[PDB]
Design a protein around this ligand. Sequence first.
Ligand SMILES: Nc1ncnc2c1ncn2[C@@H]1O[C@H](COP(=O)(O)OP(=O)(O)OC[C@H]2O[C@@H](O)[C@H](O)[C@@H]2O)[C@@H](O)[C@H]1O
Length: 176
Amino acid sequence: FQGFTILSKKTLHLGQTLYVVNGDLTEVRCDAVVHPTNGTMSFAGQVGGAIRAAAGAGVDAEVNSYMSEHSQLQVTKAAITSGHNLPSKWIVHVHSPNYSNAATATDALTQTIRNALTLADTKSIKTIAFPSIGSGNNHFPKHIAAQTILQAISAYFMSIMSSSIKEVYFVLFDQE
Ligand SMILES: Nc1ncnc2c1ncn2[C@@H]1O[C@H](COP(=O)(O)OP(=O)(O)OC[C@H]2O[C@@H](O)[C@H](O)[C@@H]2O)[C@@H](O)[C@H]1O
């Protein structure tokens, strides 16, 4: 349906709808998609390559301007650029944590999700789509990533009084 298998739906604390779906993040037409990247904001990751192909060269200039001013996106932190030719309006870039330390990696992933949602909310983003951050090149076990991200999303809306965000999509991905 519209590029995706729709697996489940849940209502969150402030009336958000959380969908778990399976498909290609870059085919989501919403306000923002979330790009798991590193401190240089490259598109070298698995998702990142697909985002860069769908967005086109325009996205490069915005990333370059940001990196020219800031030099680094710190781990777990987020930054936003236009999505250019992507179906989605914005890209929320997050410096994805590595699964170097199972004992602290889930805390870092939780914080990454919360930082992405926080930043999206300041931009009045209404719909946002997350891939399984960390579980590709950064080696999170898939089930630990899913559980941690889904719990982080629910907890974010438990922790605030108001939000512009109305739907969150968690996008699972099978293979190329
Ligand atoms: N088009 C896609 N849509 C949705 N999910 C996808 C897609 N393509 C791959 N995935 C899945 O997204 C998840 C994250 O994979 P990565 O893109 O490799 O992200 P991550 O594990 O967070 O590593 C970040 C990567 O970016 C680099 O700059 C950094 O050094 C690291 O290599 C994986 O489960 C992967 O199967």
